[PDB]
């Protein structure tokens, strides 16, 4: 830690505080996350250091000293949340939306192929650079460790319904929600409690039943007393988006996690037929 000089606080992660810092040896500028240690943690983390991909924020180093764990990450200058807030008036152009969606699907396909799930995808966890890249951040830290409130907006329905042994499908759901948000400039399911989140999902996609999601009625927190809402049109949900886009989104938002499209399959979707890599307008 003496080898690092803090520059500024750039966030309060879920696990601790995050600083922009400079490495006194390498001269490197990095994102330092101070985690306030179980052996089980150390080893799962050391596994993440090897999960290297262009669309995954690189874990540079893991420093364990004095009952503190420090995670040293690659630094990027902006997150999708800020970029979305900044692009609110005209919206992110569709080609850049497609590019970002495509890259994140690549990152997920990679993680998922190695049986690693993100668990907590959200705009604040997706970092961008001037080159038009977008990267998954805080990847794998959820399985590692377990005042600000945790956002539920991107949580898959199987997690909300109490499934303990959920799959890579949860990340696809979250990315579907982010996709919709880029397109419409409004969060898709902005719930403020677990039941509000679930009921917001139900009101748009219809209350799930055994027809569309076999086994749903036996989930830990399923209640027969859930109100029954009918499903709405995707044409109403993400209007501007073309049919290829709406088709892909619908498959990312399937209720049944086993019907939900995989990241690999999604990369082959016709939506990506004309994908390109534009450069964003970023003010840093
Ligand atoms: C700036 O480049 C980075 C790189 C890695 C990481 S990790 C992390 C970051 C962050 C930012 N930002 C604060 C929040 C976002 N969820 N929590 C975190 O743990």
UniProtKB/Swiss-Prot annotation:
Annotated Pfam families: Pkinase (PF00069)
Modified residues (Phosphotyrosine): 15, 19
Residues where N6-acetyllysine is found: 6
Signals that turn on the gene: Induced transiently by TGFB1 at an early phase of TGFB1-mediated apoptosis.
Catalysed reactions, semicolon-separated: L-seryl-[protein] + ATP = O-phospho-L-seryl-[protein] + ADP + H(+); L-threonyl-[protein] + ATP = O-phospho-L-threonyl-[protein] + ADP + H(+)
PTM section of the record: Phosphorylated on Thr-14 and Tyr-15 during S and G2 phases before being dephosphorylated by CDC25A. Nitrosylated after treatment with nitric oxide (DETA-NO).
Any one GO molecular-function label of the UniProt entry: protein serine kinase activity
Location relative to the cell: Cytoplasm, Cytoskeleton, Microtubule organizing center, Centrosome; Nucleus, Cajal body; Cytoplasm; Endosome
Effect annotated for changing residue 152 to R: Reduced phosphorylation by CAK and reduced kinase activity
An annotated GO BP: positive regulation of cell population proliferation
Residues with the N-acetylmethionine modification: 1
Modified residues (Phosphothreonine): 14
InterPro entries: CDK, Kinase-like_dom_sf, Prot_kinase_dom, Protein_kinase_ATP_BS, Ser/Thr_kinase_AS
Job of this protein: Serine/threonine-protein kinase involved in the control of the cell cycle; essential for meiosis, but dispensable for mitosis. Phosphorylates CABLES1, CTNNB1, CDK2AP2, ERCC6, NBN, USP37, p53/TP53, NPM1, CDK7, RB1, BRCA2, MYC, NPAT, EZH2. Triggers duplication of centrosomes and DNA.
PANTHER family linked: CELL DIVISION PROTEIN KINASE, CYCLIN-DEPENDENT KINASE 2
Name of the molecule in the record: Cyclin-dependent kinase 2
Lineage summary: Eukaryota, Metazoa, Chordata, Craniata, Vertebrata
